[PDB]
PDB file of all heavy atoms in Angstrom:
ATOM      1  N   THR A 321       0.832  -1.206   0.000  1.00 52.10           N
ATOM      2  CA  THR A 321       0.000   0.000   0.000  1.00 52.10           C
ATOM      3  C   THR A 321       0.871   1.263   0.000  1.00 52.10           C
ATOM      4  O   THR A 321       0.539   2.246  -0.661  1.00 52.10           O
ATOM      5  CB  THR A 321      -1.011  -0.021   1.166  1.00 52.10           C
ATOM      6  OG1 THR A 321      -2.017  -1.007   0.887  1.00 52.10           O
ATOM      7  CG2 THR A 321      -1.688   1.329   1.353  1.00 52.10           C
ATOM      8  N   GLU A 322       1.988   1.202   0.723  1.00 53.70           N
ATOM      9  CA  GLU A 322       3.034   2.219   0.698  1.00 53.70           C
ATOM     10  C   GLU A 322       3.503   2.533  -0.737  1.00 53.70           C
ATOM     11  O   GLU A 322       3.508   3.692  -1.156  1.00 53.70           O
ATOM     12  CB  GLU A 322       4.239   1.748   1.528  1.00 53.70           C
ATOM     13  CG  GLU A 322       3.931   0.655   2.558  1.00 53.70           C
ATOM     14  CD  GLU A 322       4.114   1.133   3.988  1.00 53.70           C
ATOM     15  OE1 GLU A 322       5.239   1.547   4.335  1.00 53.70           O
ATOM     16  OE2 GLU A 322       3.142   1.101   4.770  1.00 53.70           O
ATOM     17  N   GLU A 323       3.902   1.497  -1.479  1.00 55.75           N
ATOM     18  CA  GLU A 323       4.433   1.691  -2.822  1.00 55.75           C
ATOM     19  C   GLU A 323       3.343   2.095  -3.803  1.00 55.75           C
ATOM     20  O   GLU A 323       3.580   2.962  -4.639  1.00 55.75           O
ATOM     21  CB  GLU A 323       5.197   0.464  -3.346  1.00 55.75           C
ATOM     22  CG  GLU A 323       6.077   0.819  -4.544  1.00 55.75           C
ATOM     23  CD  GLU A 323       6.839  -0.353  -5.146  1.00 55.75           C
ATOM     24  OE1 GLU A 323       7.036  -1.389  -4.465  1.00 55.75           O
ATOM     25  OE2 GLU A 323       7.253  -0.226  -6.319  1.00 55.75           O
ATOM     26  N   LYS A 324       2.171   1.468  -3.696  1.00 57.52           N
ATOM     27  CA  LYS A 324       1.022   1.789  -4.554  1.00 57.52           C
ATOM     28  C   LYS A 324       0.645   3.262  -4.439  1.00 57.52           C
ATOM     29  O   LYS A 324       0.407   3.931  -5.444  1.00 57.52           O
ATOM     30  CB  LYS A 324      -0.202   0.961  -4.163  1.00 57.52           C
ATOM     31  CG  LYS A 324      -0.215  -0.470  -4.643  1.00 57.52           C
ATOM     32  CD  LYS A 324      -1.158  -1.259  -3.752  1.00 57.52           C
ATOM     33  CE  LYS A 324      -2.088  -2.135  -4.563  1.00 57.52           C
ATOM     34  NZ  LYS A 324      -2.879  -3.009  -3.652  1.00 57.52           N
ATOM     35  N   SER A 325       0.591   3.760  -3.210  1.00 55.08           N
ATOM     36  CA  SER A 325       0.218   5.140  -2.993  1.00 55.08           C
ATOM     37  C   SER A 325       1.271   6.129  -3.522  1.00 55.08           C
ATOM     38  O   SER A 325       0.908   7.146  -4.112  1.00 55.08           O
ATOM     39  CB  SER A 325      -0.115   5.399  -1.526  1.00 55.08           C
ATOM     40  OG  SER A 325      -0.326   6.781  -1.317  1.00 55.08           O
ATOM     41  N   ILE A 326       2.558   5.834  -3.316  1.00 51.63           N
ATOM     42  CA  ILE A 326       3.645   6.643  -3.884  1.00 51.63           C
ATOM     43  C   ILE A 326       3.556   6.681  -5.419  1.00 51.63           C
ATOM     44  O   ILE A 326       3.696   7.742  -6.017  1.00 51.63           O
ATOM     45  CB  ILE A 326       5.034   6.152  -3.404  1.00 51.63           C
ATOM     46  CG1 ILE A 326       5.292   6.633  -1.974  1.00 51.63           C
ATOM     47  CG2 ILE A 326       6.170   6.619  -4.316  1.00 51.63           C
ATOM     48  CD1 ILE A 326       6.472   5.951  -1.307  1.00 51.63           C
ATOM     49  N   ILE A 327       3.310   5.538  -6.044  1.00 52.47           N
ATOM     50  CA  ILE A 327       3.158   5.486  -7.508  1.00 52.47           C
ATOM     51  C   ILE A 327       1.967   6.334  -7.964  1.00 52.47           C
ATOM     52  O   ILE A 327       2.085   7.172  -8.865  1.00 52.47           O
ATOM     53  CB  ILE A 327       3.034   4.034  -8.017  1.00 52.47           C
ATOM     54  CG1 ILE A 327       4.379   3.315  -7.872  1.00 52.47           C
ATOM     55  CG2 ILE A 327       2.587   3.994  -9.477  1.00 52.47           C
ATOM     56  CD1 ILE A 327       4.276   1.807  -7.910  1.00 52.47           C
ATOM     57  N   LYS A 328       0.829   6.138  -7.313  1.00 52.46           N
ATOM     58  CA  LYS A 328      -0.353   6.936  -7.621  1.00 52.46           C
ATOM     59  C   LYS A 328      -0.169   8.445  -7.415  1.00 52.46           C
ATOM     60  O   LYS A 328      -0.560   9.233  -8.289  1.00 52.46           O
ATOM     61  CB  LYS A 328      -1.567   6.406  -6.862  1.00 52.46           C
ATOM     62  CG  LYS A 328      -2.026   5.052  -7.372  1.00 52.46           C
ATOM     63  CD  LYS A 328      -3.201   4.549  -6.558  1.00 52.46           C
ATOM     64  CE  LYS A 328      -3.574   3.138  -6.969  1.00 52.46           C
ATOM     65  NZ  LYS A 328      -4.807   2.731  -6.244  1.00 52.46           N
ATOM     66  N   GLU A 329       0.429   8.854  -6.294  1.00 51.63           N
ATOM     67  CA  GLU A 329       0.618  10.284  -6.030  1.00 51.63           C
ATOM     68  C   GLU A 329       1.537  10.935  -7.062  1.00 51.63           C
ATOM     69  O   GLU A 329       1.275  12.053  -7.534  1.00 51.63           O
ATOM     70  CB  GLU A 329       1.165  10.541  -4.613  1.00 51.63           C
ATOM     71  CG  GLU A 329       0.135  10.364  -3.502  1.00 51.63           C
ATOM     72  CD  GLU A 329      -1.004  11.380  -3.575  1.00 51.63           C
ATOM     73  OE1 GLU A 329      -0.731  12.589  -3.747  1.00 51.63           O
ATOM     74  OE2 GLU A 329      -2.179  10.974  -3.458  1.00 51.63           O
ATOM     75  N   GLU A 330       2.617  10.237  -7.403  1.00 52.86           N
ATOM     76  CA  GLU A 330       3.546  10.744  -8.407  1.00 52.86           C
ATOM     77  C   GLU A 330       2.869  10.779  -9.778  1.00 52.86           C
ATOM     78  O   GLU A 330       3.094  11.695 -10.557  1.00 52.86           O
ATOM     79  CB  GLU A 330       4.821   9.898  -8.476  1.00 52.86           C
ATOM     80  CG  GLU A 330       5.895  10.510  -9.365  1.00 52.86           C
ATOM     81  CD  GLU A 330       7.168   9.683  -9.432  1.00 52.86           C
ATOM     82  OE1 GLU A 330       7.511   9.040  -8.408  1.00 52.86           O
ATOM     83  OE2 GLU A 330       7.834   9.692 -10.511  1.00 52.86           O
ATOM     84  N   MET A 331       2.030   9.791 -10.063  1.00 51.55           N
ATOM     85  CA  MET A 331       1.357   9.765 -11.362  1.00 51.55           C
ATOM     86  C   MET A 331       0.391  10.941 -11.522  1.00 51.55           C
ATOM     87  O   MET A 331       0.317  11.531 -12.605  1.00 51.55           O
ATOM     88  CB  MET A 331       0.647   8.433 -11.597  1.00 51.55           C
ATOM     89  CG  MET A 331       0.134   8.285 -13.010  1.00 51.55           C
ATOM     90  SD  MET A 331      -0.346   6.591 -13.393  1.00 51.55           S
ATOM     91  CE  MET A 331      -0.592   6.690 -15.149  1.00 51.55           C
ATOM     92  N   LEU A 332      -0.317  11.300 -10.444  1.00 51.09           N
ATOM     93  CA  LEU A 332      -1.181  12.476 -10.457  1.00 51.09           C
ATOM     94  C   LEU A 332      -0.391  13.729 -10.815  1.00 51.09           C
ATOM     95  O   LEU A 332      -0.822  14.530 -11.659  1.00 51.09           O
ATOM     96  CB  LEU A 332      -1.882  12.661  -9.108  1.00 51.09           C
ATOM     97  CG  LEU A 332      -2.967  11.638  -8.759  1.00 51.09           C
ATOM     98  CD1 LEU A 332      -3.567  12.037  -7.415  1.00 51.09           C
ATOM     99  CD2 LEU A 332      -4.036  11.563  -9.830  1.00 51.09           C
ATOM    100  N   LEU A 333       0.775  13.881 -10.189  1.00 52.60           N
ATOM    101  CA  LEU A 333       1.677  14.994 -10.486  1.00 52.60           C
ATOM    102  C   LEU A 333       2.101  14.986 -11.959  1.00 52.60           C
ATOM    103  O   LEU A 333       2.024  16.010 -12.639  1.00 52.60           O
ATOM    104  CB  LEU A 333       2.903  14.939  -9.577  1.00 52.60           C
ATOM    105  CG  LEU A 333       2.925  15.717  -8.259  1.00 52.60           C
ATOM    106  CD1 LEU A 333       1.550  16.179  -7.782  1.00 52.60           C
ATOM    107  CD2 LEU A 333       3.658  14.942  -7.168  1.00 52.60           C
ATOM    108  N   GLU A 334       2.528  13.820 -12.431  1.00 52.93           N
ATOM    109  CA  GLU A 334       2.935  13.615 -13.823  1.00 52.93           C
ATOM    110  C   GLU A 334       1.851  14.066 -14.839  1.00 52.93           C
ATOM    111  O   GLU A 334       2.121  14.894 -15.731  1.00 52.93           O
ATOM    112  CB  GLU A 334       3.293  12.138 -14.017  1.00 52.93           C
ATOM    113  CG  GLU A 334       3.535  11.697 -15.461  1.00 52.93           C
ATOM    114  CD  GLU A 334       3.363  10.194 -15.654  1.00 52.93           C
ATOM    115  OE1 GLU A 334       3.266   9.452 -14.642  1.00 52.93           O
ATOM    116  OE2 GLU A 334       3.298   9.738 -16.820  1.00 52.93           O
ATOM    117  N   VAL A 335       0.640  13.542 -14.692  1.00 54.68           N
ATOM    118  CA  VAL A 335      -0.422  13.803 -15.666  1.00 54.68           C
ATOM    119  C   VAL A 335      -0.923  15.236 -15.607  1.00 54.68           C
ATOM    120  O   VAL A 335      -1.259  15.804 -16.646  1.00 54.68           O
ATOM    121  CB  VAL A 335      -1.591  12.782 -15.626  1.00 54.68           C
ATOM    122  CG1 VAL A 335      -1.048  11.357 -15.636  1.00 54.68           C
ATOM    123  CG2 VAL A 335      -2.490  13.000 -14.422  1.00 54.68           C
ATOM    124  N   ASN A 336      -0.934  15.825 -14.411  1.00 53.13           N
ATOM    125  CA  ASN A 336      -1.329  17.219 -14.260  1.00 53.13           C
ATOM    126  C   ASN A 336      -0.322  18.212 -14.817  1.00 53.13           C
ATOM    127  O   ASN A 336      -0.723  19.233 -15.361  1.00 53.13           O
ATOM    128  CB  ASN A 336      -1.730  17.536 -12.807  1.00 53.13           C
ATOM    129  CG  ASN A 336      -3.121  17.023 -12.494  1.00 53.13           C
ATOM    130  OD1 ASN A 336      -4.109  17.521 -13.040  1.00 53.13           O
ATOM    131  ND2 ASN A 336      -3.206  15.990 -11.676  1.00 53.13           N
ATOM    132  N   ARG A 337       0.971  17.917 -14.699  1.00 48.56           N
ATOM    133  CA  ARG A 337       1.997  18.694 -15.413  1.00 48.56           C
ATOM    134  C   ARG A 337       1.903  18.518 -16.920  1.00 48.56           C
ATOM    135  O   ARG A 337       1.966  19.497 -17.667  1.00 48.56           O
ATOM    136  CB  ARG A 337       3.389  18.299 -14.955  1.00 48.56           C
ATOM    137  CG  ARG A 337       3.655  18.742 -13.525  1.00 48.56           C
ATOM    138  CD  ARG A 337       5.077  18.403 -13.168  1.00 48.56           C
ATOM    139  NE  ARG A 337       5.427  18.934 -11.853  1.00 48.56           N
ATOM    140  CZ  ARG A 337       6.620  18.768 -11.302  1.00 48.56           C
ATOM    141  NH1 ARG A 337       7.555  18.090 -11.960  1.00 48.56           N
ATOM    142  NH2 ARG A 337       6.873  19.269 -10.100  1.00 48.56           N
ATOM    143  N   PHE A 338       1.736  17.277 -17.372  1.00 48.66           N
ATOM    144  CA  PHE A 338       1.572  17.065 -18.817  1.00 48.66           C
ATOM    145  C   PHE A 338       0.277  17.654 -19.399  1.00 48.66           C
ATOM    146  O   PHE A 338       0.218  17.948 -20.596  1.00 48.66           O
ATOM    147  CB  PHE A 338       1.793  15.599 -19.204  1.00 48.66           C
ATOM    148  CG  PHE A 338       3.241  15.243 -19.407  1.00 48.66           C
ATOM    149  CD1 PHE A 338       4.006  14.713 -18.357  1.00 48.66           C
ATOM    150  CD2 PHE A 338       3.857  15.439 -20.651  1.00 48.66           C
ATOM    151  CE1 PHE A 338       5.345  14.381 -18.546  1.00 48.66           C
ATOM    152  CE2 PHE A 338       5.205  15.120 -20.845  1.00 48.66           C
ATOM    153  CZ  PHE A 338       5.948  14.587 -19.798  1.00 48.66           C
ATOM    154  N   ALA A 339      -0.745  17.857 -18.563  1.00 48.00           N
ATOM    155  CA  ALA A 339      -1.948  18.527 -19.025  1.00 48.00           C
ATOM    156  C   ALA A 339      -1.608  19.951 -19.484  1.00 48.00           C
ATOM    157  O   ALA A 339      -2.271  20.478 -20.371  1.00 48.00           O
ATOM    158  CB  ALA A 339      -3.027  18.537 -17.956  1.00 48.00           C
ATOM    159  N   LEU A 340      -0.568  20.564 -18.906  1.00 46.51           N
ATOM    160  CA  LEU A 340      -0.104  21.868 -19.402  1.00 46.51           C
ATOM    161  C   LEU A 340       0.280  21.807 -20.879  1.00 46.51           C
ATOM    162  O   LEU A 340      -0.007  22.740 -21.637  1.00 46.51           O
ATOM    163  CB  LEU A 340       1.077  22.403 -18.597  1.00 46.51           C
ATOM    164  CG  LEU A 340       0.795  22.724 -17.123  1.00 46.51           C
ATOM    165  CD1 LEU A 340       2.101  23.110 -16.464  1.00 46.51           C
ATOM    166  CD2 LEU A 340      -0.194  23.868 -17.026  1.00 46.51           C
ATOM    167  N   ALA A 341       0.969  20.731 -21.268  1.00 47.23           N
ATOM    168  CA  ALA A 341       1.346  20.544 -22.676  1.00 47.23           C
ATOM    169  C   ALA A 341       0.112  20.313 -23.580  1.00 47.23           C
ATOM    170  O   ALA A 341       0.112  20.732 -24.751  1.00 47.23           O
ATOM    171  CB  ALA A 341       2.369  19.422 -22.817  1.00 47.23           C
ATOM    172  N   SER A 342      -0.946  19.702 -23.034  1.00 48.65           N
ATOM    173  CA  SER A 342      -2.203  19.586 -23.799  1.00 48.65           C
ATOM    174  C   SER A 342      -2.748  20.970 -24.137  1.00 48.65           C
ATOM    175  O   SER A 342      -3.077  21.249 -25.303  1.00 48.65           O
ATOM    176  CB  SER A 342      -3.257  18.735 -23.066  1.00 48.65           C
ATOM    177  OG  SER A 342      -4.498  18.756 -23.764  1.00 48.65           O
ATOM    178  N   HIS A 343      -2.847  21.832 -23.126  1.00 49.64           N
ATOM    179  CA  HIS A 343      -3.295  23.214 -23.343  1.00 49.64           C
ATOM    180  C   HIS A 343      -2.414  23.950 -24.309  1.00 49.64           C
ATOM    181  O   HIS A 343      -2.906  24.598 -25.221  1.00 49.64           O
ATOM    182  CB  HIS A 343      -3.386  23.988 -22.028  1.00 49.64           C
ATOM    183  CG  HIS A 343      -4.405  23.427 -21.051  1.00 49.64           C
ATOM    184  ND1 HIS A 343      -5.651  23.078 -21.423  1.00 49.64           N
ATOM    185  CD2 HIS A 343      -4.313  23.160 -19.696  1.00 49.64           C
ATOM    186  CE1 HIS A 343      -6.329  22.624 -20.360  1.00 49.64           C
ATOM    187  NE2 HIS A 343      -5.508  22.670 -19.299  1.00 49.64           N
ATOM    188  N   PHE A 344      -1.104  23.887 -24.105  1.00 50.96           N
ATOM    189  CA  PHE A 344      -0.171  24.668 -24.934  1.00 50.96           C
ATOM    190  C   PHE A 344      -0.172  24.191 -26.385  1.00 50.96           C
ATOM    191  O   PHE A 344      -0.277  25.007 -27.322  1.00 50.96           O
ATOM    192  CB  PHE A 344       1.243  24.597 -24.366  1.00 50.96           C
ATOM    193  CG  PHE A 344       2.082  25.806 -24.672  1.00 50.96           C
ATOM    194  CD1 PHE A 344       2.117  26.881 -23.786  1.00 50.96           C
ATOM    195  CD2 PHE A 344       2.832  25.878 -25.836  1.00 50.96           C
ATOM    196  CE1 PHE A 344       2.909  28.004 -24.061  1.00 50.96           C
ATOM    197  CE2 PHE A 344       3.620  26.999 -26.123  1.00 50.96           C
ATOM    198  CZ  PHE A 344       3.656  28.059 -25.232  1.00 50.96           C
ATOM    199  N   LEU A 345      -0.063  22.880 -26.572  1.00 46.65           N
ATOM    200  CA  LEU A 345      -0.049  22.306 -27.918  1.00 46.65           C
ATOM    201  C   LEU A 345      -1.348  22.580 -28.694  1.00 46.65           C
ATOM    202  O   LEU A 345      -1.305  23.062 -29.839  1.00 46.65           O
ATOM    203  CB  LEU A 345       0.245  20.801 -27.881  1.00 46.65           C
ATOM    204  CG  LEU A 345       0.326  20.092 -29.248  1.00 46.65           C
ATOM    205  CD1 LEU A 345       1.302  20.786 -30.182  1.00 46.65           C
ATOM    206  CD2 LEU A 345       0.818  18.683 -29.017  1.00 46.65           C
ATOM    207  N   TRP A 346      -2.493  22.271 -28.096  1.00 46.07           N
ATOM    208  CA  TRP A 346      -3.762  22.499 -28.805  1.00 46.07           C
ATOM    209  C   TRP A 346      -4.132  23.953 -28.935  1.00 46.07           C
ATOM    210  O   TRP A 346      -4.844  24.341 -29.883  1.00 46.07           O
ATOM    211  CB  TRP A 346      -4.903  21.685 -28.195  1.00 46.07           C
ATOM    212  CG  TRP A 346      -4.638  20.205 -28.242  1.00 46.07           C
ATOM    213  CD1 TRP A 346      -4.743  19.284 -27.208  1.00 46.07           C
ATOM    214  CD2 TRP A 346      -4.233  19.415 -29.412  1.00 46.07           C
ATOM    215  NE1 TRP A 346      -4.434  18.017 -27.643  1.00 46.07           N
ATOM    216  CE2 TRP A 346      -4.127  18.023 -28.948  1.00 46.07           C
ATOM    217  CE3 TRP A 346      -3.954  19.708 -30.742  1.00 46.07           C
ATOM    218  CZ2 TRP A 346      -3.747  16.993 -29.796  1.00 46.07           C
ATOM    219  CZ3 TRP A 346      -3.580  18.657 -31.597  1.00 46.07           C
ATOM    220  CH2 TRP A 346      -3.481  17.331 -31.132  1.00 46.07           C
ATOM    221  N   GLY A 347      -3.661  24.763 -27.993  1.00 41.81           N
ATOM    222  CA  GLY A 347      -3.741  26.231 -28.104  1.00 41.81           C
ATOM    223  C   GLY A 347      -3.050  26.733 -29.369  1.00 41.81           C
ATOM    224  O   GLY A 347      -3.658  27.443 -30.173  1.00 41.81           O
ATOM    225  N   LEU A 348      -1.792  26.346 -29.556  1.00 43.14           N
ATOM    226  CA  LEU A 348      -1.033  26.731 -30.753  1.00 43.14           C
ATOM    227  C   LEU A 348      -1.659  26.174 -32.028  1.00 43.14           C
ATOM    228  O   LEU A 348      -1.758  26.877 -33.041  1.00 43.14           O
ATOM    229  CB  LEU A 348       0.417  26.245 -30.651  1.00 43.14           C
ATOM    230  CG  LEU A 348       1.286  26.881 -29.563  1.00 43.14           C
ATOM    231  CD1 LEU A 348       2.577  26.088 -29.452  1.00 43.14           C
ATOM    232  CD2 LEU A 348       1.551  28.327 -29.920  1.00 43.14           C
TER     233      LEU A 348
END
């Protein structure tokens, strides 16, 4: 549960940062 939660928390960070590239790319 320790490792699962660390993976999940980091993944949330990952996808939310990459959502910036969705906005920027489709914006352009």
Side-chain angles (χ1 to χ4, degrees):
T321 289
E322 339 246 301
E323 197 182 339
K324 282 158 134 173
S325 173
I326 283 167
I327 290 161
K328 291 178 186 185
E329 285 295 313
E330 188 180 327
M331 189 166 190
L332 290 182
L333 267 16
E334 171 202 349
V335 311
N336 282 293
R337 291 184 174 180
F338 276 93
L340 296 175
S342 174
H343 297 314
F344 208 91
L345 182 53
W346 300 130
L348 294 169

